[PDB]
Every structure is written in C-alpha cells, then in structure tokens.
Design a protein around this motif. Structure first.
Motif, PDB file in Angstrom:
ATOM      1  N   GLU G  17       0.821  -1.204   0.000  1.00 27.56           N
ATOM      2  CA  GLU G  17       0.000   0.000   0.000  1.00 27.56           C
ATOM      3  C   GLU G  17       0.857   1.257   0.000  1.00 27.56           C
ATOM      4  OE1 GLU G  17      -2.181  -0.796   3.496  1.00 27.56           O
ATOM      5  OE2 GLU G  17      -3.503  -2.282   2.563  1.00 27.56           O
ATOM      6  N   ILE G  30       5.036  15.826  -8.963  1.00 30.99           N
ATOM      7  CA  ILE G  30       5.873  15.322 -10.048  1.00 30.99           C
ATOM      8  C   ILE G  30       7.324  15.745  -9.854  1.00 30.99           C
ATOM      9  CG2 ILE G  30       6.322  15.512 -12.512  1.00 30.99           C
ATOM     10  CD1 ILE G  30       3.406  15.486 -13.074  1.00 30.99           C
ATOM     11  N   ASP G  31       7.544  16.971  -9.373  1.00 27.13           N
ATOM     12  CA  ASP G  31       8.886  17.541  -9.344  1.00 27.13           C
ATOM     13  C   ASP G  31       9.807  16.858  -8.339  1.00 27.13           C
ATOM     14  OD1 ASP G  31       8.015  19.364 -11.256  1.00 27.13           O
ATOM     15  OD2 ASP G  31       7.433  20.849  -9.745  1.00 27.13           O
ATOM     16  N   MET G 120      12.388  -0.713 -24.611  1.00 24.26           N
ATOM     17  CA  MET G 120      12.990   0.168 -23.616  1.00 24.26           C
ATOM     18  C   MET G 120      14.506   0.070 -23.605  1.00 24.26           C
ATOM     19  SD  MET G 120      10.668  -0.829 -20.364  1.00 24.26           S
ATOM     20  CE  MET G 120      11.949  -2.057 -20.059  1.00 24.26           C
ATOM     21  N   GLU G 137       7.210   5.651 -17.941  1.00 22.06           N
ATOM     22  CA  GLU G 137       6.954   7.087 -17.898  1.00 22.06           C
ATOM     23  C   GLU G 137       8.248   7.874 -18.055  1.00 22.06           C
ATOM     24  OE1 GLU G 137       4.739   8.102 -14.431  1.00 22.06           O
ATOM     25  OE2 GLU G 137       2.967   6.946 -15.033  1.00 22.06           O
ATOM     26  N   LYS G 138       9.323   7.421 -17.402  1.00 19.28           N
ATOM     27  CA  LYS G 138      10.616   8.074 -17.587  1.00 19.28           C
ATOM     28  C   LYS G 138      11.099   7.969 -19.026  1.00 19.28           C
ATOM     29  CE  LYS G 138      12.559   7.428 -12.926  1.00 19.28           C
ATOM     30  NZ  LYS G 138      13.671   6.776 -12.182  1.00 19.28           N
ATOM     31  N   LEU G 139      10.685   6.926 -19.744  1.00 21.64           N
ATOM     32  CA  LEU G 139      11.096   6.725 -21.125  1.00 21.64           C
ATOM     33  C   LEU G 139      10.075   7.247 -22.128  1.00 21.64           C
ATOM     34  CD1 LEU G 139      12.824   3.214 -21.066  1.00 21.64           C
ATOM     35  CD2 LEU G 139      13.867   5.478 -21.169  1.00 21.64           C
ATOM     36  N   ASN G 140       9.022   7.924 -21.658  1.00 28.59           N
ATOM     37  CA  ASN G 140       8.008   8.525 -22.529  1.00 28.59           C
ATOM     38  C   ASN G 140       7.320   7.470 -23.394  1.00 28.59           C
ATOM     39  OD1 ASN G 140       6.731  10.983 -22.797  1.00 28.59           O
ATOM     40  ND2 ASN G 140       7.967  11.662 -24.544  1.00 28.59           N
TER      41      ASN G 140
END
Lengths: 181, 169, 179, 181, 179, 172, 173
Positions: G17, G30-31, G120, G137-140
């Motif tokens: 969790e 996000i930052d 990837m 997500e880091k790799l778009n």
C-alpha cells in the motif's frame, strides 16, 4: 466415542460397499468431491461437512447402511434393528435418499455379468464405446446416462426399453418405483 | 514479565502458531504490523497489555498447555479461571475465525477466494483472506453474512453452524 | 450469482472432464498455461482472462460442455437444451472449437482400452517409447503426434492408417469430418 | 517481433520440454546459471547473452527445437521444415550441440518409467542414495554419472553395461554414436 | 588465469554443492563468516584470506571437490584423477578435513526424503520446535546438533540411536569411521 | 539558462541517475554533487539548452526532456547530429554496459579484475561505474584501452556487451 | 491535517500500500521524489494538497476502508460523494495503472518485462508492475494519451480483460 465408532464402521466397508455408498450419495456429494473418496471415512467426513452426519443425526448413515444390506454392522455399531429401520424409512418425509436412487441400486443388484454385458449392448446407440468398457459396472453406466439426460426420474424410457430387452424383474422394479413414488 | 519468557515462547512456537498468534493479536495491536512474534510480544509488553495472564491466554488460544506448564507453570483450569475473572485480550470473533481456518484445506480456501473475488496473487491462507476482507470492510463481528453465505455455498455447513453459534452468543 | 454458478458447474466436473475440456481448449490456452490447470475453476479463470467466459458470453462454456457430452450441466446450470446447442453450433461461425479438435475428441470417445493399446502398438515406430507408456490416453497421443507434424488438419494419413488398423467406425468419423 | 515470437514459443513449452532444453544446453550454460532457469524466457536470455540467439541467428534455437522433436514450433513460428533441419544439421560443422549430448537425450527418450526404475536399480553402487530418488529422470542420472566421471565422451562402458542389461536399441544407439564420432 | 579458473570452477557449483562445501568448511570458516556466502567465489576468497587456497596450494580445494564427488571438476579444471586423490588423502597428515566431517557428509548423502522426515522426527525432544521445520536439510540438523553438544567426535550416542532406528548402513558408516 | 531549470533537473533525478550524470560528465575539477556540476557547466558556458538536453538524453529521462526543456527525442538527436557531443561515446558505452549487469555479474567481474588490480579499496557495494572509475584511476581502462574489460566480459559469457565494445572500437 | 493522523495512517499501511500510494501521488508531486510515504504526506500537507478529503481519497484508492472508518470516521459512500463533487487528487490514469497491477502475478510481470525490453532497452528484472510503469513514464512510452503499447502488450499475453480496462478508460476521456 463417535469418531472411533465412525472409523470402525469405515473399516468394515470394502470397495463394492464404497462404490454403492458413493452412488447412493450422488444427490448430496458432487462428482469432484466424490472422485478422491477412496475409503468410507472420507465419505463420512464429506457427510459431516454437510451436517448430514453428527452424533445426534445418525439418520443418513443408518439409511445408507440399511440400503446396502449391512444389517450386521447396523445392529453392532449403531444398535439398530431392521424393524426399526423399516418403521423409520416408511414414515412420510424421513427418507433422505430418493426413491429413484434406491431403485437404480436395486436394479444394479439384480443384474448379473451376462445381463450387464447385454445392458451395455443395449445402450450402444446413446453411449460412446469407451464408456461401455468391461471394467465398468451398471451404476457407472447409470451415471453416464444421467450425464446425457437419457436417464432420470422423468426420463425412464431408455432404461425401460433396455430392461425389457433383458429381464422381467427389472421392469417390475421400475414400475414398482413408478407407481409408489 | 521478562524477555526470557518471550524468548522461550517464541522459540517454542512454530510458523503456523506464529501466524495464528499475529492474527489473534490483530485487535490489541490494531495499528501496527509486527513482522515476527517476538516483535508482537515486545509491543504488547511495551503497551502494558502483556501480563502473565495475557501470555497465558495467548498460549491457551494456540492450545499449547505444555508451554503453560513449562514456562508459566499453569494448568488448563487456572487459565480458564483467569479468563473467567479478567477480560479477554483476543475477542471470541478472532477465536472463531481461527477455528474456522483450522478446518479448511487449500481447495476450500481457493473456492472461497473464487466466490469472494467478485466482492474484492495466489497461495493465500484463510486468515489472510479475513484480513484482506477486514481492510475492505467486508467482515466484522457484526458483519458475518457474507462469510456465512460463502461457507454455505462451498458445502462447509458445519462452519456456518460455528458462525451461527457465535452469533447466538 | 454468476461466480457461484461457475463454482457449481465446476464441482460436477471430475479430473477426466477437466482433461477433456483442456484438450478441447488447446487451440486457445497454450501448453505452459494449461500445465498448472488442476481443477475446473482454474480453466474458468484462464478463460475469463481471455474474455471467452463472462456473464454476457456463455457461448464458449456451453460449447465446451456440449462437446464433452455433459448435457446434464447444460440443462441444469446454463438452462440450455440439446436442440438449442445443435442449432447454435451448426450455425456458420458460432462454433468456437475447430472441427479437427471435435473429431479428435469424438474418435477418442470411440476407442476402448484394448483398442488404445493396439493404437499405441501401431505408433511404435513414429513416437518415442517413453511417450508411449501405459499411463497415457489417446488425447496425449494426439498431442504428441501434433508435436511431430504427423497429425494435423492437412495430415490425416497416419491417423487414417492407424484407425484402419483399429476399427472401421473411426475411419468413418475421419471421412465424415473430411466433408 | 523477435521477442514476441520467443515469448510465444516459450508459451508452448512445458516444464518437461524446458528440462530437456536445459539438458541440451549444459555445454553452454553452466550449473550455477542453469539452476534458476524455470521458464523458457530465462534460457532464451542466457542464450542471447552468449549471442547464440539473435534476430539473425536462429540456428541454436532451431537445433534445440528439432532435438526435442517440437517440429510443430519449427514449422509454425520459425518457418522451418523437418527436411531443412535434417539437411542443415548434416552439414559438417553446423551442429552446435555435441553428438554426446544428443545421444544422451535420444537414449533417454527410449527409456520408460519401469525401464528408468531398473536403470536406477543398476547404479546402486556407484551413485549416492539421495541421487537415486524417484524424483529424478534419466537426464539427471546422466548428469550425476558425469559428476563421477563414469559417463562421458570417452567413458561409455558403464552406460553400455546398464543399457545392454535393459534394452538392445539403447546399445545400438550408443555404438552408432561411438563409431560416427 | 588462476582467477579465471576459480571463477569457472565456481560457475559449475549449484546451491546444493555450495551448501556441501560450506558444511565441509565448518572447521575453518566460522558461522558468522559463512552466513553471507551465496556463491563459490566467496568461499574461495575466504579460503584465500586464510592462505588455504593460492596458485601454489590447491590441496584444500582439491580435497573439497573430491569430498563432494565432483570428480569431473577435479579432472577438468585441476587435472586430477580419482586415484590421485584417493592416494593423497589417505597418506598420514595430508587430510585437511576431519574424518568426523567427512562421515557426517557421507551420512547426509545417503539419506533420502522419507529418511530425513524420520530423522527429524527422532530429534523432536533435543531441538527447539521452530527449528524442526521442513526447510532444513540433514546437514543443518547436524550443525544444530553440534551447537547443543549432543553430536560430536566423542558424542556419537544420539546419532547412533537415530540411525539404528532408521537404517543399518548408517550404523555401518558410523562404526567404520570409529575404527 | 537559469537556476530554476537546474533546480528542477537536480530535484527530479534520482540517486542512480545523478551518479550516472556525474560519471558521464567526468570528462568535461570534480563536483561533489549534481547541482554544483550543472552550475559549473553553465558557468563554463558548456551548459546551453542543447547541452542540458544532451545530458537528459544520456540519462534516459525523456520525460524531463518533454516537461522541462519542451523537446522530444528527434530534436535532441538532430542536435547531437549537428553539434559536438558533451559526453563522449566512451562514457555512453560504459553507462550502457553498466545498465546490463546485475550484482552477481559485477561481483564476478570484480574477481577477475581484482587479480589484475588488487582491489585496494573496499566499498560497501561497488557499482559498475564505480569500478570503471577505480580502473581509470589505475590506467586500466580508457577509450583506447578496452582489452581488459573486453576479456573479462568474455569470461563471464556476456558476449553481447563484448559486441557493444567491438562496435564502439570499429567507430574510430 | 495534523501529524497525529499522518502518523497513524503511515504506520497502519503495509509495504504494498505504501508503494501504491507513492505511485498514485507521483502526479500531484511530479517535481520531487519522496523517499517514504510519511514524508510524502507531509509534503502534500505543506503544499496545501492534503485536506481531510484528500487523505480520504488516498485511503480509498489503496482500498483501505478500515482506516477510513477507524481514523477519519468516514464511510465508503462519503468518500465516493466527495470524489463526485470535488476535484480528484489522483487522476483516473494512475487508478487504471494500479488496477492493472492488482491483476498481474509474477509470471505476467515477467512476460510483460520480456516484451517491453525491446521497447525500452535491456537496462534488475525482478520489479513490480508499478516500477515498470514508472520506468516507462521516464522513457516517454506510456501516458494518459499514449496507451497503445501497453494495450498491445497486455493483449499479446492473453490478459484481454486488462485491454478492456484500458479501452474503457479511453472511452471515459
């Protein structure tokens, strides 16, 4: 000592008695649970799980033992005479096994080897060849007919035909069930 | 209470008894997740809810009277009288859940999971299922209808009767 | 409700019915995923994952149950009669199992124990010995035959030879499939 | 996609096919690296790391699939016929699996359960008791014999003895490998 | 070269062979140093730290490989035959492993699964109840026995009792070691 | 360039990506942390928008290329085609090899390279880039000195990384 | 909000969790990269995006209703009505990803990783589904408007129900 009594009762039933009991319990213990039943104590356990067998509910066990004609075990381990079992089983409502199952067992008890082979020959048109092998008894053939909805309380036509092809007393048993139940 | 008693107990219990003890003590330590039983007992002791009688009750729930005799030097009647006099650490609901879990094999648990998945990984135990339901507000001492119905549907009517007898208490 | 219905249907299927169902589903569930299927509920789950079994798609379940001749389950739990299933499966496109699979299952239904032993004797030269042990039924022999591309939709000749060695009704079933 | 094709080929291989594949690759994947291989994708990645499996180097994968008699996978997913593979492997030098390994696997394919039990009985004095359990197949027995240098490319006599005591075709396979070596 | 050879030898040992090596090295590598050993190279480096394994002292490594019946590794990577090791280890003084450790390992190699169940059952009273779970092999039970001074070079009585309850060849191994 | 962009990049990266950025920028004064490194690159004039784009591209953080600099992979690829590289192909090759090794492979590599180097330093757990740095300090690896790493990668059956090394060697 | 409630919530959650909450909150913060969940909740509080309703939504998304009833003294329908009227802290995309992850065992994750490695790069491989979604997500490679690759890969592993989940999400936007 209810548990050890059940174990002792189980120690007296052989493979034929176990097959008969499993067939007589088809309406309460499904196929998947019946497959791994390899001794009487496991069937007793499955009945206990459905509450059909307790220290204060010996009705179904006495009925099963009376129907397979083990009156000696009934008198020895449960202290019950044949007259008591008749008086109980003919009171309306107290019979937990269906009359259809009992007539099927009685029809299996009245079929010899040659009559069994003739019965398998009679069902050649509605049953596959592998399900009519020599290693199968009449009760398994009854099960296989029920799987194809050609045998049941409302579907006795094929059973009646085959029995009439074989013997008279089998048809008499069929009609005796049909009229009285 | 002393650390030596907790040690003797932890080394004496096995894995199943440890998991059962954690599930039973889920009510006292209702907000922490003890990794092992030593930490659970240490938390109970630091919270004061682990006296000699409390550990006696805990050993009684796992039916380890040999440990009650060797470690705490108590018998069955003494622990029963202590429970008659003092409040219980583990509610009768937890005892009922453990008693139901002890009477289920892996196939029955799998069937229960199959029926209940509509309401909600593999290789789960019954107590893990009850925990996952508790987190989902699906089972409670006053909310046993779903568990009762599901136990009925798998032809374990004796466990439904156990639930009925608990509800009648 | 729906899940309880599937559990009840599964409680009536034994290990043999499960083996038959898994054989009929070989064309949709590969070998590796079929290996750990030891009860009917697992097959139902792996079928649900493929969207072939849902509350609004009982087609494949009814077809599977009809092909293994469990008319009792069809009439009891899915409320479907035999004539309905015949009309459904005999409509072009609605049959989800291939005719090759159904002919293999039906030909397996027509081979007794002695005929199975003779069948194993017939394939003594084209299948390894350890995969011809007494503990194997005819469906496993069909799988092993497909593995060596000696049995298939276009290669029925070895099957026809062995069946003609065994019995004539088997050849009749094969030719009736031929259409 | 090459990876999707490898995944699909892996989805068709069961645990026994995987054990066979790992045995045939013992000469390229050592014991320590082989132990955690529980599915086909792990073996495929081990091969990719050795460059024995690439999008432009399907040779070893096709050889593995041919040696375990999975011609269906070769024809369906790799577009390869049986005659093509038997002609390729019969070209001098292009066989990456050793004849010793292939002979061991083929001799294992001709030993049934009872013959394997007799085989385990034959090796009672040169193999430890824990390494002679029922949970072991003949390929594992070959590995255990190799560990004690009683089985190998230059020591075929004990295998000869046990196989000739068991079955003739095994001795024929052994000698046919032995001459053409 | 030498390091590559040790790495290659390590790549041939699985987890069970590694456990065997760690048990055979109990007299030279203590428990705390043994715990994080998860591959053969770590045990090799621990031996190097004690100078029991160097480019000019392969004796202990050859003994370890001979005692776990990896004659293939000895002949391939160390260029050593079975007869050479037999002649070397039975010369007075050259045996670096104690006969007690070797007899314990040999008794562990001769116990199947059911015999291990019965052996663990026999020790129910001398080992804490959590430490008698299925997750232990016979060598771990021997270690736990040595920790409680119920098993040892002078204390063979409990081992003899359990083995006599189990099997005769185990008693033969014990008595042959004793003489 | 502005300090806001540098702050965004530094706080958006994780520990491994920061270590990789430092290792890649080892060629361009040793900054202790990443933010100081970016400030130094800007203060030297060697951190325009294109240079930071290249740095984000090498650490495989395209999400930062899209959110922070508002660019995609094709734009940064064209920038690398037109302008000189901030990170040499040797550093990219080293990072690429490091991305394809688990802990066991690194330990086995350390054993062989240890006999060739001694392993004088004892860290808690060394990464591949840490090992490559310790080798560079000992003059054991270089853009023109990849033979030892090639042999060690061969001996652990990582022939794909050996092929990576050889493709790099054929590009010069 | 107060540190007492945050302490109760953080210590009451389990590891899965905690990871799920961090992944779901990857969008609101996000930052930054929060190391643990307690620090994440403190950051959400200092950023103003952690009212009682926000913590209720977070506990609801991790399907931890027992804490909704014990800590916040709220019921399921209360949190559902709050989400019906007020804006959502966690977007439906994150909920969809967590939902897909809930229905994947280790074998499915390994097969997904195998298929995605070509897409990837070879650079672990013992991760969870949410770790894979983060690395994508880091790799778009995945986004609320970019679900085609994940849909295709879920289809190819015979998890057609998850493809239908993605399709319903796309039919919601």
């Amino acid at each position: 000592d209810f548990s050890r009594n059940l174990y002792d009762i189980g120690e007296q039933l052989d493979s034929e008695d176990l097959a008969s009991l499993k067939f007589l319990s088809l309406d309460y213990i499904p196929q998947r649970k019946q497959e791994p039943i390899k001794d009487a104590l496991m069937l007793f356990q499955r009945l206990q799980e459905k509450r059909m067998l307790e220290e204060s509910n010996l009705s179904f066990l006495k009925e099963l033992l009376f129907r397979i004609n083990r009156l000696d075990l009934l008198i020895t381990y449960l202290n019950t005479r044949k007259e008591e079992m008749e008086r109980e089983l003919q009171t309306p409502g107290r019979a937990q096994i269906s009359a259809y199952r009992v007539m099927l067992y009685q029809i299996s008890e009245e079929v010899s080897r040659s009559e069994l082979r003739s019965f398998k020959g009679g069902l050649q048109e509605e049953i596959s060849k592998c399900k009519l092998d020599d290693d199968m008894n009449l009760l398994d053939i009854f099960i296989e007919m029920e799987k194809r909805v050609i045998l049941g309380e409302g579907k006795l036509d094929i059973l009646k035909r085959v029995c009439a092809q074989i013997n008279k007393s089998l048809l008499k048993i069929i009609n005796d069930y049909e009229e009285f139940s | 209470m002393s650390a030596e008693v907790i040690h003797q107990v932890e080394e004496a219990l096995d894995t199943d008894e440890k998991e059962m003890l954690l599930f039973l003590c889920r009510d006292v330590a209702i907000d922490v997740v003890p990794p092992n039983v030593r930490d659970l007992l240490d938390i109970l002791r630091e919270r004061g809810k682990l006296s000699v009688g409390d550990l006696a009750e805990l050993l009684y729930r796992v039916r380890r009277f040999d440990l009650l005799k060797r470690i705490l030097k108590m018998d069955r009647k003494a622990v029963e009288t202590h429970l008659l006099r003092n409040p219980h650490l583990v509610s009768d609901y937890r005892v009922l859940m453990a008693e139901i879990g002890e009477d289920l094999d892996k196939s029955d648990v799998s069937s229960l999971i199959f029926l209940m998945k509509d309401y909600m990984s593999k290789e789960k135990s019954f107590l893990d299922l009850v925990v996952e339901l508790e987190k989902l507000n699906l089972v409670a001492p006053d909310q046993l209808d779903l568990l009762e119905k599901c136990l009925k549907n798998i032809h374990r009517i004796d466990l439904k009767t156990k639930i009925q007898k608990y509800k009648q208490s």
